[PDB]
Design a protein around this ligand. Structure first.
Ligand SMILES: [Hg+2]
Ligand SMILES: [Hg+2]
Ligand SMILES: [Hg+2]
Ligand SMILES: [Tl+]
Ligand SMILES: [Tl+]
Ligand SMILES: [Tl+]
Ligand SMILES: [Tl+]
Ligand SMILES: [Tl+]
Ligand SMILES: [Tl+]
Lengths: 410, 410, 410
């Protein structure tokens, strides 16, 4: 009988938890929480960490397959590096937000009561090589995202080159195989949506605990995050888009007035994928060639998830300082390196950035299995339902603003 | 040149072993056995444990795919829960047999000379979550059937939902991918048959050892098992079928006289799969609609393996008490929970229930790799060639008796 | 801008390294090498060891699929065992070369400064069973080639039997699934070629180090290898081919004069695969039936890589004695057992035998991860670009000489 609009359904869990949390935050100790409540939350998270691999894998082989040079027209080539570098400065800005805002510093948690100290990172030499799977499956089997990616990529590539062969039996193999991976990719997504319906019961149990414990000083950071994001966000639109809108003689203001229908749909639908109908509709509405938006719009909804890139860029810096940890340059550049190759997986749905987070964590040697991290992420996940809104509303903006740029360039 | 009818071929190994065992049971110590003989047996078992995963996996994703709601007509819906609950009480009865018969108590073995004590089971909290793979591959890679299942299922589901999409490229992906898994599924089966031809040389080496050692007090349990089964079995037909045959105004006695051809073929062919021709033949023979038996008969031959459910239900209780172990309620209900989701894999062939056993073992934390268990299962496997006969002859009965019930209901 | 003909491109790295090595072999200690140079080499090797599994797997399931009895005409049957036994004596000869030549004895290396002593090999009993994967994935995940093979094979088989079924849905499954594996298989190959373009930068860094260290006494073995090979090689042609050419009343000398175009193309192209056009051209040129060379030539270019079989047969014996190790009979027969089931994978491309080497190593418990082995293989790999030439030129010869033999037999 649970049919309600997801977003509220969650916001229902979200606003109602806080209180039931804080009201149980004074009276019956948070331990009842800890034993009767958390058990429902984690399942959630676990239900996510579950997917991370297949979807880190499948997604990126297929990801690569779309981008694979030059199984793309010079029209893509143009738009491609738009996306890269708009996704690239996106996070550059995420750090800026996260270097002027320090949410998590002043929350620092002891977990079980023990502070966390990271395991030593191997000589820069090794770390390189370590990207090269010693053995695909053996790497794939257990964590080690650094290679998992590397590989899957090189596959995607190799694959595109197989459809371009003399032999037909061969030319074929690719198609199928590839296809099959894809869909695995897809299935994921749909479990994601299945998950994002336990998401209400979920988000409730998690945050309630984080409010039950940590007192209330928490929300101060939580809205301090929300800030760091939106304020990053809205500024991104001004600093990058409006900046490049005029740089090809397109009126930025009007552009928005057109995209006003689609964006303020993305805001509330959060599905960069299911909101394709709306997107391509506005496309022609503002005078874009069929043969141009028919290709970019179905590609940027997936890749160039510039909004995600930031989210992580920031979310990262929340987590680290919540452990009271300092992020060493080398991994500061990793965050992004990752955070980008992250958004090449995503297809732009509900949980999206959340799961990736893990991914960016795991790469930077912050194993979730570690309770410190665990209880911290746990927060960000709760609220993710919110940040997600604006995030996906910008992912979308980012896609049209490329489209119009290559339609004028075209 | 080894061409002989499998069943005899085995019974040949089976009856001839016992003697050559017991005759070597008095004279040249069983150690010669242990060093020249067992080495051939185990290979067998190993040849089985080998398959368990793929076939625990492939089978259940595809399993799910057939059942996936509502990628089935309301005609299935009806028959579905017949099967469930006839498979469900089936094992309920298996426990009854195994609580009035206690085969294994009075055989209790020391293995290397050390008794076995089970590893502590995690707090009921964890055990739940532990069903959610932390990471598919990483779980899939090594045991942990509890999740392997959970997952594969949720996949099967997700998959059916992919063929029901707007996008065609998508609608496709499912089909193929799915397909491909399926066939992996199938291949298994055919190696199974390839195995069940080493089965003669196999069953010989195993039991001979168990007769070489353990003296003879063993057969007392072995025929005490055979009992517990058949007597469960024949009674199942009376207590359930004849019970529900009349409960829709169908004459049970006649029904049998019709099914008399097909069942007494299943008894001897043991292939719930290859015996489909015979099944559907009798179907119309007793007045069943084409559009009704064309769907149930090709589905119940695979799922609703009620005979299997018991076999395990019982086999379980043999093993445990052969170690001198007591089966805690919580895992007593697991056996079944499992034993059912077991028979959703199986396609109904030779080794069938045997392999699953492992599956139900592994779930209930009884690692075969442990010699105690190892030598015990080892027995059940030998004789499985027999119990199998009646077992598959009932699996079949169970399928027609549903069919006629929904054809009258229809 | 790196476009140059691969072979030179490498020989360029190869001849130029030696010197820059030896010149840095007297002056600035080899340690600069060790810290600025090796790091580039290994990557290479790592880039290979990476592939070994998929391609050990995919290749052999599909391998099996071609050979699977009797999903082949009695025309294959004939040619099949030609290939087997020409691949079989091939290596028999490889040992002969490697028992009269002892390259590596007189190079013996201390690695870090510690000699290597192999881990004890389990009782011959276990080792057998150990071929039967305890669990496919779990084996597949981490090394254990002995089973990986065994399994994949039994699959290939099982698969062919699935396309020969009553059920169509089934008949299908096989096709796709199979296909899909295949192509994975293929992709590999193409990354191989992608690798064999870092191969110049690669082969440079590796050998330079091995010249930087070990002084120069090395080349003495390196050309002593080159010897052991070519001299094995050219003799193989005389001892086997010319021997069996006349044994069916075909003139060996002429045969060569015909194959003179194709072989001396294989020598320089090293691609048993891309050189199929040339092969089948000469086929009719020397009077071979369309319906005969259309089947053997596209099968022997892949299987019956008799040249490979030797390479390893020998390469093995280089490595072992470079560690100062003695190769126990039981594993001496393994080398081959392997080395053959090796060449059933390969499709006959650039790196080919190199990677397999690993495979034959891993089986004979010589983990590359061990630096001793590591620095040694490392040599063989460098020069492999050379030996490869003759090797593939004979693989090819081996294929026509079967073809003509079954065309006369036919
Ligand atoms: Hg995660
Ligand atoms: Hg098992
Ligand atoms: Hg290797
Ligand atoms: Tl986007
Ligand atoms: Tl994406
Ligand atoms: Tl059945
Ligand atoms: Tl089944
Ligand atoms: Tl060849
Ligand atoms: Tl091959």
């Amino acid at each position: 009988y649970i049919e309600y609009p997801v977003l509220q359904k969650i916001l229902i869990g979200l606003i109602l938890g806080a209180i039931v949390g804080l009201i149980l935050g004074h009276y019956g100790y948070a331990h009842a929480v800890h034993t009767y409540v958390k058990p429902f939350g984690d399942l959630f998270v676990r239900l996510l960490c579950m997917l991370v691999m297949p979807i880190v894998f499948a997604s990126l082989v297929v990801g690569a397959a779309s981008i694979s040079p030059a199984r793309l027209g010079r029209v893509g080539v143009k738009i491609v590096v738009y996306y890269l570098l708009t996704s690239a400065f996106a996070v550059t800005l995420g750090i800026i937000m996260a270097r002027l805002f320090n949410p998590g510093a002043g929350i620092h948690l002891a977990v079980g009561g023990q502070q966390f100290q990271p395991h030593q990172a191997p000589p820069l030499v090794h770390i390189l090589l370590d990207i090269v799977p010693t053995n695909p499956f053996g790497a794939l089997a257990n964590g080690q995202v650094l290679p998992t990616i590397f590989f899957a990529i090189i596959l995607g590539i190799a694959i595109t080159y197989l459809m371009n062969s003399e032999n037909e039996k061969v030319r074929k193999s690719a198609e199928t195989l590839l296809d099959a991976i894809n869909g695995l990719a897809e299935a994921m997504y749909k479990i994601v949506n299945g998950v994002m319906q336990y998401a209400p019961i979920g988000v409730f149990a998690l945050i309630a605990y984080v409010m039950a414990e940590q007192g209330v000083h928490v929300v101060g950071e939580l809205a301090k995050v929300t800030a760091a994001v939106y304020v990053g966000l809205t500024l991104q639109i001004l600093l990058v888009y409006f900046v490049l809108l005029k740089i090809y003689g397109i009126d930025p203001i009007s552009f928005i007035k057109h995209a006003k229908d689609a964006m303020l749909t993305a805001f509330v639908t959060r599905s960069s994928s299911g909101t394709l109908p709306v997107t391509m509709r506005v496309a022609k509405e503002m005078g874009i060639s069929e043969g141009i938006y028919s290709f970019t719009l179905p590609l940027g909804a997936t890749i160039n998830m510039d909004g995600t890139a930031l989210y992580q860029g920031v979310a990262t810096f929340f987590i680290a300082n919540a452990l009271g940890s300092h992020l060493t340059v080398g991994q500061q550049l990793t965050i992004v390196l990752t955070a980008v190759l992250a958004s090449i997986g995503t297809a732009g749905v509900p949980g999206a950035g959340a799961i990736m987070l893990c991914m960016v964590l795991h790469s930077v040697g912050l194993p979730l299995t570690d309770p410190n991290v665990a209880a911290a992420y746990a927060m960000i996940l709760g609220i993710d339902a919110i940040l997600d809104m604006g995030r996906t509303m910008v992912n979308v903006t980012g896609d049209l603003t490329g489209t119009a740029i290559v339609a004028k360039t075209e």
